[PDB]
Amino acid sequence: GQEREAAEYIAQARRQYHFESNQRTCNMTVLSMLPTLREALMQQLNSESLTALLKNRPSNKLEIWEDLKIISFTRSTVAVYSTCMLVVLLRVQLNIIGGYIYLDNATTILAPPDVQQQYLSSIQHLLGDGLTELITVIKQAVQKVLGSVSLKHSLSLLDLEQKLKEIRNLVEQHLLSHYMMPDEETLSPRDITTIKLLNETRDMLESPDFSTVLNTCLNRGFSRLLDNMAEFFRVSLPLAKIIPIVNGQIHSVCSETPSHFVQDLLTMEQVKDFAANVYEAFSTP
């Protein structure tokens, strides 16, 4: 009757206030971490140093340019992957822990402040060892796709999309969850609970629903990479002219600013639906 309907209404309403609050937190955490992701990519894929050498009358000028060919494409390709992973991994973690935090409002507390801290600190991996492994793999893939391609080779916008698809296919069949968490290995009483949480996160990253939502974001991130570059094709350009167009994409793919790619992921209703389902699974007794 109406009593049951009121009961389900209040439960949903309660779940929804905490979920929404938790999305606001997650949105903040994503945007505060972006400059660190951006800094790590620039340091590990430093185009601007190679450029500096070229603007300084060097020998092996073509070795530097071939290096730039790889670094530029690698950096923009990795910028898209890591940004999408950043957003979706934080949605997972914050709604997994949010779920537990929601339930502890009912003797034994499952997720106290120290478990929350040690669990959330696992984001480390994506910005750390995971990112470097990701760079190594994308760099190899770019090296296979663009290695034998001349700097004079003129590429149309369609050719460039096709190179990007080839890079993607080498990467995504080399899952992507290996880059977001450290491997599980073959204790302290709240380290037990932390291990249970990291395992549940790993399982989630291997779920079809998670893989679906990450694929959506990736698709939209690479279309955007291409839309951004379309403005420079007004026709085909020499690959050497494409390098600096591609090289500069990191600044927009990893911008905190509104209307940029990260904010479109944060306001993308498909990722919210996925996050809401995570929170619900982990907040129900």
Partner: peptide, 17 residues
Amino acid sequence: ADRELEELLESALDDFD
């Protein structure tokens, strides 16, 4: 001794601007 390449590389170096 590749003029066309040297032109191409000089002008593309300005495109990082």
